[PDB]
Design a protein around this ligand. Sequence first.
Ligand code: HEM
Ligand SMILES: [C-]#N
Length: 123
Amino acid sequence: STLYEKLGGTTAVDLAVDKFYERVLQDDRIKHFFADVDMAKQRAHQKAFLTYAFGGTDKYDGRYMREAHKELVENHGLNGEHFDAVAEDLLATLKEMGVPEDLIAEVAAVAGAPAHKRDVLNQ
Ligand code: HEM
Ligand SMILES: [C-]#N
């Protein structure tokens, strides 16, 4: 079974993403990164992205992480602390939803992979 399946599939990811952005927009460390972001579009992209990242689809139909975050790194000071805030907010949301610790851990390994971090932070 994939991580996607174990978590509860579409409706679990849909709920997690919605809740995650609720948490992010209240997080003073990072909420301002989304000041000019269309959150309907962002929600749909993240649902599609995590579906892919958790093995629910072969591919992500959307931007690469490096190009996606480039303007944030170059113009708005996006750094490792913001990255860690995002990972922490995602995992907090899953804990709150009742996702078991062993699955929360598999998600942490995805969100924290160097191939993700280096591209997002354009390092
Ligand atoms: C790290 C765990 C991480 C992921 C995964 C991620 C995903 C992601 C997607 C799928 C998009 C949309 C891309 C597309 O256009 O197809 C996107 C866009 C933005 N992100 Fe992100 N992102 C991750 C990490 C971070 C971090 C650490 C921040 C800032 C705190 C952040 C922020 C943003 C913002 C803002 C956007 C929209 C960019 C824009 O167009 O202005 N992401 N992310
Ligand atoms: C990016 N969220």
